[PDB]
Design a protein around this ligand. Structure first.
Ligand SMILES: O=C(O)CCNc1cc(N2CCc3ccccc3CC2)nc(-c2ccccn2)n1
Ligand SMILES: [Co+2]
Ligand SMILES: [Zn+2]
Length: 428
């Protein structure tokens, strides 16, 4: 029906700072039945100074900061045309270039005044990770309830132990009308927090995680990579497949919570800035979706930007988990991980290959394979290309000389993992 295919937007209006900090808010935002939530009056209720994220303030703060520009043809939010302008298509291609905040600002400001073109420029992926450079901005985001913050005990990304750019650091987007964010799910299905600084609106579209394989099938049919390509759903295709589509406007000061694995796309209707980062709540729902996308990525040779094995061990070492469903999932992941390390050690020892203990140091990143981008946990196959390259076991073995010239390192002895694992118990 027309009613079921156009579901109402899950919405919250905070009348007070107290309601912002209610446990009811966290349960509403993370409810699997709410794929996306818009929190009206969030900035006002928390007295957030969003002026700190105004274009004028940003220019003064770091005018020469790099902006990744996406050049796009301006089109209505429910349209994406082929080159002839006669039919709708899924692929939504852009050109990628670079400029500065100061220069993008002048373009943003000048277009805004002139309104008082066919081709537009979208200022993307602006990196607000530098804690000194963006101190007042980042400090302002400490006013949010804990579950929404960049860093918190209940956020899996706060147990990584190092920076994951754009996930546990804030990204800024500077927009003019028509600036288009193509359809996607977040890295490893992690939740996202997005605030419109404004002065104008953003239009949002979203589909429940449940339907993602159908959207992936459309992408394949229309010649674009679902996981890594740039695409814009044809709404009529979605409706013809009985897929409900959420549609709403995000006004200045409104916070959008993108729940785990929600497929979403966005278009600026006015001139505005957006800020965003990811959160991974420590729930069975989020953890399951994170691990299944982790496994699917490996099938499809796509890098998992969240190193889920590394993360699961860190969580197990420090966090008390009381939910039996989530505990079981983490416990299983850890046991599989120990077994996988063990198989590698045994085959290395059978081959007569030496393993050196390397250990871990503070702030050390998690490693990925240079050839296939898979997470490489604990047992590292290392080659000298000063410059060292890490490989997974398969790719190391595949080298023309096999393991000749490859040094194998171990970052955690069996006993280290066994002791961490044994201490990880279900909390009362
Ligand atoms: O419009 C907004 O306020 C939110 C923008 N969100 C974006 C924006 C964004 N990009 C800027 C938008 C854009 C425009 C045109 C082509 C490609 C892209 C992708 C990079 N990428 C991502 C992304 C990437 C990987 C995993 C998860 N998310 N998210
Ligand atoms: Co995104
Ligand atoms: Zn590999």
């Amino acid at each position: 029906p027309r009613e079921k295919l156009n579901p109402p937007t899950p919405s919250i209006y905070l009348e007070s700072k107290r309601d912002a900090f209610s446990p009811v808010l966290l349960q509403f935002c993370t409810d699997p039945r709410n794929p996306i939530t818009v929190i009206r009056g969030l900035a006002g209720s928390l007295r957030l100074n969003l002026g700190l994220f105004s274009t004028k303030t940003l220019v003064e703060a770091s005018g020469e900061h790099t902006v990744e520009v996406r050049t796009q043809v301006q089109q209505p939010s429910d349209e994406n045309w082929d080159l002839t302008g006669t039919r709708q298509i899924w692929p939504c291609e852009s050109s990628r270039s670079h400029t500065t905040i100061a220069k993008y600002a002048q373009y943003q400001a000048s277009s805004f005044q002139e309104s008082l073109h066919h081709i537009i420029k979208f200022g993307t992926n602006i990196d607000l990770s530098d804690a000194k450079r963006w101190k007042p901005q980042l400090q302002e985001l400490l006013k949010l309830p804990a579950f929404m913050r960049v860093t918190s005990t209940g956020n899996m990304l706060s147990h990584v132990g190092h920076t994951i750019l754009g996930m546990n650091t804030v990204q800024l987007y500077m927009k003019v009308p028509g600036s288009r964010t193509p359809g996607h799910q977040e890295n490893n299905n992690f939740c996202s927090v997005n605030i419109n600084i404004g002065p104008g609106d953003c239009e949002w579209f979203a589909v429940h995680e449940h339907y993602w394989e159908t959207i992936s099938a459309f992408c394949d049919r229309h010649g674009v990579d679902y996981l890594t390509g740039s695409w814009w759903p044809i709404l009529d295709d979605l409706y013809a497949s009985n897929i409900p589509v959420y549609r709403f406007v995000q006004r200045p000061g409104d916070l959008v919570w993108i729940n785990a694995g929600t497929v979403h796309w966005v278009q600026a209707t006015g001139w505005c800035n957006n800020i965003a980062w990811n959160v991974g709540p420590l729930t069975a729902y989020q953890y399951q979706l994170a691990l299944e996308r982790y496994e699917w990525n490996e099938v499809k040779n796509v890098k998992s930007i969240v190193p889920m094995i590394h993360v699961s061990w860190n969580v197990a070492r420090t966090v008390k988990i009381s939910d039996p469903d989530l505990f079981k999932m983490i416990k299983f992941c850890l046991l599989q991980s120990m077994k996988h390390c063990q198989v590698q050690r045994e085959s290395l020892v059978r081959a007569g290959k030496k393993i050196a203990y390397q250990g871990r140091v503070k702030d050390e990143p998690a490693y990925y394979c240079n050839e296939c981008d898979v997470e490489v946990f604990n047992i590292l196959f290392v080659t000298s290309e000063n410059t060292y390259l890490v490989h997974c076991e398969g790719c190391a073995r595949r080298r023309s000389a096999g393991l000749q010239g490859v040094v194998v390192l171990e970052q955690y002895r069996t006993e280290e993992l066994a002791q961490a694992y044994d201490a990880f118990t279900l909390a009362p």
